[PDB]
Every structure is written in structure tokens, then in C-alpha cells.
Amino acid sequence: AMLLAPGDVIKRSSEELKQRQIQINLIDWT
Amino acid sequence: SSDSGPLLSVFALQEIMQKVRQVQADYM
Amino acid sequence: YIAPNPRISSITLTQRITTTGPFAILTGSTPTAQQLNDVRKIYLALMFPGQIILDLKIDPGERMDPAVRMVAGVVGHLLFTAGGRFTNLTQNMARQLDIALNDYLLYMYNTRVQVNYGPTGEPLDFQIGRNQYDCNVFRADFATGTGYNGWATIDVEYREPAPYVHAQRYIRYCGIDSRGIGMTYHCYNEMLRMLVAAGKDSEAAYFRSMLPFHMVRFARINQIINEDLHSVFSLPDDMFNA
Amino acid sequence: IKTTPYLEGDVLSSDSGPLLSVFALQEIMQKVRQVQAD
């Protein structure tokens, strides 16, 4: 299964995501 | 990476035909 | 006269003689005019089954390594046909080929296996292999031809009335017709059964790879008899059967 | 199409030699001469 999460919390928790080896697609909104 | 049925079928058929052409290399 | 794979004779000898053994020693040899003449003699005998019979040129002055006679006994079983409706060999020659194959099957130089002989001293009167598989079938018998290409396979048949009214028969080698890739036959399959029971996997793979050359050569010979030779001088059907 | 080479004494050669029909004639004639030869 997959999930959709907001970009700000992904940017804040991306260290945990890469520590747990999860895949992410993100669009930075400038 | 990833894999799928059609592309993998084309793949395996390509190596099977390669082996059969190696068989017919003796077929003059 | 063409090799199965052209130009393989001119490559380096170390490549061709891969390992040790009778077949390995035999491979790498090259023929001369005497063997060329004898080979075309063999082919003429194949082209004329009902008139040409063969026997060995035995002299007291012979001296050579036994492997050449050994391989000849191994391969004449597949090359020649006997029994059925026509024969190509004498009883003496069939006996000699059979005792040579007996010698080969008892020749053991890599691995020592169990052997279970029979009541008599006849050739091939024994059982071999982890499973007991009978080799006594290949002993020559002209009633059916168990040891050659007449074994339980049709060789002569009839299709349509010929222009010459005494040559109705069609002579087909190994049961195939010209009008084939990868097809086998009974005698060859049972020879491979014998060889895999003997555990000689080197020549098992060798013969398994060499099948198509044999099949195409015999198809060509089949074509030569069934097409070119149809003339008034062909042997009558009753005399060919008798 | 040329036949595969066969060695001639000390040097390889690839000559087809005489025709097969001529060879068959000579072989049969020599054999029957041997049959009568005594």
C-alpha cells in the first residue's frame, strides 16, 4: 500500500524516511 | 528494478530464440 | 564429402583433443586416400542395400591401438541396418561389431561400476547400471534386426503405381521422408539409453549433439535412392523381398 | 562446394579425385577379377 502526505511534514521527517528506507515523491512549491 | 509479464515474455522468448539460433548454427 | 562442421580440421590440435579416453584419442586423427576410398565404398554400399554386403579387411600384419576397432564396433550399430526386410552386413561382420561393443561396454577407465554377467559367455549377456538394464538386445539377429536401424521401425512402403511396374517400393532410411528438425528414432534413442545407463556422459553429449548431421546425411541418401535410381534395371520386388 | 581436406602422405589436400561411378566400375571389375583369379 501507498500513502499521500503533505510536503512540509515530508521535508521535516525525510531523515526518518531515509533511515527506514521508504520511497518518496515530492514537489517543492518554492 | 521492476518487472512485468509482457516485457518478461519478450525477454525470455528472445533468449530462447538466441539458443535455437545457436542450435541451427550447425544447420547449414 | 563434407564434415559436419567445415574447417574444424585446420584449427589447433590442443583445442580438438580436449581430454583423455578412446574417443578423445581417436578424435584429432586425419584420414588418407585409403580411408577415403573405403569411405566411398561404405557410401556405395549404403546407396545399394540389396546388392552390396560388407566385411572387414583382416590380415595377419595388422597392429594398431584397440580403440579404433573399438569405436568401429560402437558406431557400426547405428550406421548399418540389419534385419527387417533387407540387410547390409554379413553374419561375421555383425558378430565382430557386437563383440567389439561388448569390449567397449566392459572397458572402464574412469569409474568402476558393478557388473552382473549371464549364464553363457555370449557377448552382451550381462546387466549393467544402477538399475539393471539389459544390453543383450543389441546382439545381432537377422530375424528382426534388434541391433541395427531395422529395429521396430518401418523401412519400405508403397505410395502410387510407379512408371516401372517392377519397382513399386519406396526405400526410406530411419523412417523419415524428404517432403525435419530434431526428430529421433527408436534405435538411436535406445543407443542413448544404453549409453546413459553405462554412464559415459561424454559420448552421450557427443552423440546427442551429432544427431542432426546423421539425420540430414541419411535424408540425402534416402533421396538419392528414392529419386535418381528409378530405372528398368532396379531389382524386382519379389526378389528383393526374397 | 569443396570437400573437406584429407592428408596426402605429408601434405594436406582437398581434391575430389576420380568420379564415383568410375570408382564403382573399377572396384567391381577388380573384385570380379580377384574372384576369377586362380
Partner: protein, 158 residues
């Protein structure tokens, strides 16, 4: 450090204490094991030869003119290392049953769940509406306070 990997792997089996092995780097401190603790742990008779020959090599080094001292009891060795492990630590097939968490608009067709919280995203309204239009979806919400700990808890538990 200790004079051999054999003792380090032996105490790894006994507790799991990761201890390094001297490789001629600095004039450091070295521990050594005598007959008492050798008989305690049950090292093979081959390794006593290696340890004693290393000790006499250090003796030769000292006579050529680095600190070496020995541990006598198991309790002394426990105080020496200063750490006791937690035994088994099994590792699963993967970290979480969720493989991917994204934000892209083209992945809403394939997405299966979504968490919501007040965020400054120009397309959050759009993606939230599109995910909510589905007939059977797994929607979670924030209730204020700390969002990061809640999201971390949810992503470990789902």
C-alpha cells in the same frame, strides 16, 4: 583493545560485547586473559598458544628498550567492559508494511491512504479532495499539538 579476534568473538558469544583488536597503532592499553578465565570460557587449546606468543612478543618489545594489564575474574571483566547486552535482536523482512509515501498529483490514482494536518501546500486542498473522492480509502487526521510524533507513530504502526 584485546590481543586477538578470537577472544573478542568469544565474548561476543558470551554477552555480545563489541571489542576491538590491537593492530600496532598507538601505545595503548591492552587486556589479557590467564588460565582462570580461559578455563571459565572454554577456549580451545590452540588459542592459548597465540595469546602467550603475543605476550612474549610484547616482552621482546619491552626488552628492546605500551601498556598491558590482565583481567582475573568475570565480575572484573564485566566492570572492565562496562556494558551488558540485551541478548537477541531479530530483524524483519522490511521496516514497514508501507513502502512509499508521496505527494505527487499523478499518484492519487494509485495511493491507498492519507493523513491530514494544517499545512502550507498550494495543492493540499486538491490532493485531499481527490483522495477523499475514492469509494474506500484510509483517512487519518491530526488533532493539534505535535504532528511529527503522531505521523512517526502512524508510519511505524502502518
Amino acid at each position: 583493545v584485546v590481543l586477538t579476534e578470537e577472544i573478542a568473538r568469544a565474548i561476543e558469544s558470551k554477552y555480545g560485547t563489541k571489542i576491538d583488536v590491537y593492530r600496532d597503532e598507538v601505545p595503548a592499553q591492552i587486556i589479557e586473559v590467564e588460565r582462570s578465565l580461559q578455563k571459565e570460557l572454554g577456549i580451545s587449546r590452540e588459542g592459548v598458544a597465540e595469546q602467550t606468543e603475543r605476550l612474549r612478543d610484547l616482552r621482546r618489545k619491552e626488552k628492546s628498550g605500551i601498556t598491558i594489564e590482565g583481567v582475573m575474574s568475570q565480575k572484573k571483566l564485566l566492570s572492565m567492559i562496562g556494558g551488558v547486552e540485551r541478548k537477541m535482536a531479530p530483524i524483519g523482512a522490511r521496516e514497514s508494511a508501507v513502502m512509499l509515501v508521496s505527494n505527487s498529483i499523478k499518484d492519487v490514482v494509485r495511493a491507498t491512504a492519507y493523513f491530514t494536518a494544517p499545512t502550507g501546500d498550494p495543492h493540499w486542498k486538491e490532493v485531499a479532495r481527490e483522495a477523499s473522492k475514492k469509494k474506500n480509502i484510509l483517512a487519518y487526521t491530526s488533532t493539534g499539538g505535535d504532528v511529527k510524533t503522531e505521523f512517526l507513530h502512524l508510519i511505524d504502526h502502518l
